[PDB]
Structure formats: C-alpha cells, structure tokens
Amino acid sequence: LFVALYDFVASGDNTLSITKGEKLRVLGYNHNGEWCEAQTKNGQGWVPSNYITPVN
C-alpha cells in the first residue's frame, strides 16, 4: 500500500494522474525503476517512482 506525495498530471502514453495524499496499489516497475505501474480509484497506469511512498 502506497500514498502519493505530489500531484502528477498524466502526459498520455499510459501514464496516470495522481493527487497528493491519494492511495495507490503498486503492481511493479520499469527496467530502470524510474516508473511505477499503479492502480488507483481512477484507473491503472504509470507514475513516477519517487512521487509515491509506502504507508502503514
């Protein structure tokens, strides 16, 4: 379980918009770990790995 640290606006290419304080489930990462594939209430798609952090 993760929480979003900052807003991120989707730039297409299967990226997902997230809002600060939103909850996220993490499915995995790309090859260099810079991108994270996540699921939120709004869908599923890629977000920056350091825009999120574990919670609990």
Next chain:
Amino acid sequence: APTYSPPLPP
C-alpha cells in the same frame, strides 16, 4: 512504460 524519464520531484 514511457521511454522518457519522469519529471523530478518538486
């Protein structure tokens, strides 16, 4: 996953 790198954190 996007081939570009993501924005740096604010």
